[PDB]
Amino acid sequence: TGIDPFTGTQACITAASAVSGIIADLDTTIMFATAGTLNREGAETFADHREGILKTAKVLVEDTKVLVQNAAGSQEKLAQAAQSSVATITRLADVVKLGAASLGAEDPETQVVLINAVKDVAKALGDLISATKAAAGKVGDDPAVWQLKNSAKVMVTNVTSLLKTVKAVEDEATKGTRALEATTEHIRQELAVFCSPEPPAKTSTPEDFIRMTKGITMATAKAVAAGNSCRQEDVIATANLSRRAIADMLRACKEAAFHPEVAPDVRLRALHYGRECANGYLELLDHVLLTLQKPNPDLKQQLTGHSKRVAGSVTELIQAAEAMK
Amino acid sequence: TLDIDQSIEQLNRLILELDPTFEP
């Protein structure tokens, strides 16, 4: 019987047309993204899309193997293999688009890098489907069989390049976030030490304590600036400045408070507002981290309230220092 | 389950499986 024996071949032709459209669709998105109009969906951290990309990417690796294995054999099995791969790349493209958009319109250079990485996969799939067609029901020795295997590696090479780009993107997207977190743990360790019953390394004068307190002023303002700019470089600088400023203020506070010439109520008062200041400040940094994950106007206005809470303790801290003489 | 650190390992080996110039 003349059962249709070019359906596999036919599926390859239809697949090639589909892949052409996806690439054209990714070029369009690169255009929008380059112009800065591919906006973030409020929050929707990159960490979410990363899983969907990776999951779909592993499915695409299986579809690659199925294509290679099924080029020799049934037309129907080849037709099925072609169709499956096109469905997967459609989905992979779409989830990568969402991941790139989740980086936000203020980082357009990285958005385009990400979309191109998946575009490269799309191109490699087109070549792979073309190679299976040329190899459709050919046996091992045939150069088309050689070419099919070679086409499939140039596909998986692209897939791993996509995965490498995703890893590089996410590290850069959180380098400041992860630095600020390191600072909050250091501050907590410092504050646990500050609050511990062990004495400070030495005593000091109100003037040493006072000069550290003023450091809080410059750091709070800086932190507020990083939360408003959301620039990872400002976040890095805030992390470094905040760690030193709070650590220093806690050291001098306890050293000044334990000075023999300080009355027990004034020592008590100084220690209390030292803790208060650090705690208010940790809540400010924690609000900064929330702002970095969903940088809308609402969260940023709330930075004002946190800055006031730190400032309120600073006033107490300065009056406590003066009362040590 | 596998994360990107291990996937990129299995896939670099898979690139060599497919690679028809590479046959030890």
Numbering used by the authors:
A (entry chain A): 1967 to 2291
B (entry chain C): 692 to 715
Could you give the paper's own sentences about this structure?
Structurally, talin contains an N-terminal FERM domain (F0-F3) linked to 13 helical bundles (rod region, R1-R13) terminating in a dimerization domain (DD). The FERM domain binds and activates integrins, while the rod region contains vinculin-binding sites and actin-binding sites that couple integrins to the actomyosin machinery. Tensin3 consists of an N-terminal PTEN homology domain, a large intrinsically disordered region (IDR), and C-terminal SH2 and PTB domains.
We first determined the structure of the talin–R11R12 in complex with tensin3 TBS to 2.76 Å resolution. This revealed that the tensin3 TBS forms an amphipathic α-helix that binds between the α2-α5 helices of the R11 bundle, forming a 6-helix bundle. Residues D696, S698, and D710 on tensin3 TBS establish electrostatic contacts with K2024, K2119, and K2133 on R11, while K2031 orients its sidechain away from L705 on tensin3. The hydrophobic surface of R11 engages with the uncharged face of TBS, with tensin3 residues L702 and I706 forming the core of the hydrophobic interface, demonstrating that these sites are critical for tensin3 interaction with talin R11. The R11-TBS structure demonstrated that the positively charged residues K2024 and K2031 on talin are involved in R11 binding to tensin3 TBS. However, the double mutation (K2024E+K2031E), referred to hereafter as the “R11m” mutant, completely abolished the recruitment. This approach is justified by comparing the predicted structure and our experimental structure of the R11R12–tensin3 TBS complex, which are almost identical. Determining the structure of the tensin3 TBS in complex with talin R11R12 enabled us to design a point mutation (L702E) in tensin3 that completely disrupted its interaction with talin. Thus, L702 is critical for tensin3 interactions with all binding sites in talin, and these interactions share a similar mechanism. Talin R7R8 is characterized with the lowest Kd (15.8 ± 0.9 μM), with an enthalpy of 42.72 ± 2.06 kJ/mol. These endothermic binding profiles are similar to our previous observation regarding talin R11 with tensin3 TBS (17 μM).
